[PDB]
Design a protein around this ligand. Structure first.
Ligand SMILES: [Mn+2]
Length: 174
């Protein structure tokens, strides 16, 4: 894939910490996205790369009077509308829980209040893949019920080797 080739080329070329950090960030984003794409495929849901909350409201209630509400402009990775419930979806790729809790608290306090005012039943769902062991952990009782089985086959090895190469190249930096 040119994904890896593009990244191998920037890593080979990079000479300073500050540009390497932007490469590091872009590796983790691509790792996140590859997870989200393989998830949405296995679950047959429309893959999206962030959706503005305002877009989400307007899809589930097109007669919304957007201007009459204070809608925080958060862009979660995706969403599912069941016709009766809204599930806000965030994909994580991580060995730890830290970012799952940060995002869970952020989306709970920023999304749910306006959806409660508008009258949309709403659940914050977060799906996390461990890059090392491939195991999937799910926040979202409604998400679990609607997707008890997740038929993804993942492989994060390219991403690990790119970031291992990047951080070997800058072992004695900061
Ligand atoms: Mn995410």
């Amino acid at each position: 894939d040119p994904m890896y080739e593009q990244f191998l080329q920037r890593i080979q070329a990079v000479r300073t910490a500050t540009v390497a950090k932007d490469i590091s960030a872009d590796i983790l984003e691509a790792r996140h996205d590859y997870f989200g794409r393989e998830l949405c495929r296995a679950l047959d849901i429309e893959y999206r790369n962030a959706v503005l909350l305002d877009e989400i409201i307007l899809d589930v209630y097109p007669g919304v009077n957007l201007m009459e509400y204070n809608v925080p402009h958060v862009t979660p990775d995706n969403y599912i509308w069941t016709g009766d419930m809204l599930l806000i979806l965030d994909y994580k790729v991580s060995v730890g829980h830290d970012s799952t809790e940060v995002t869970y608290k952020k989306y709970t306090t920023l999304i749910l209040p306006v959806m409660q005012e508008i009258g949309i039943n709403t659940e914050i769902c977060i799906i996390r893949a461990n890059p090392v062991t491939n195991q999937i952990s799910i926040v979202g009782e409604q998400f679990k019920r609607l997707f008890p089985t997740i038929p993804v086959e993942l492989n994060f090895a390219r991403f690990f080797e790119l970031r291992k190469m990047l951080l070997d190249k800058f072992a004695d930096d900061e």
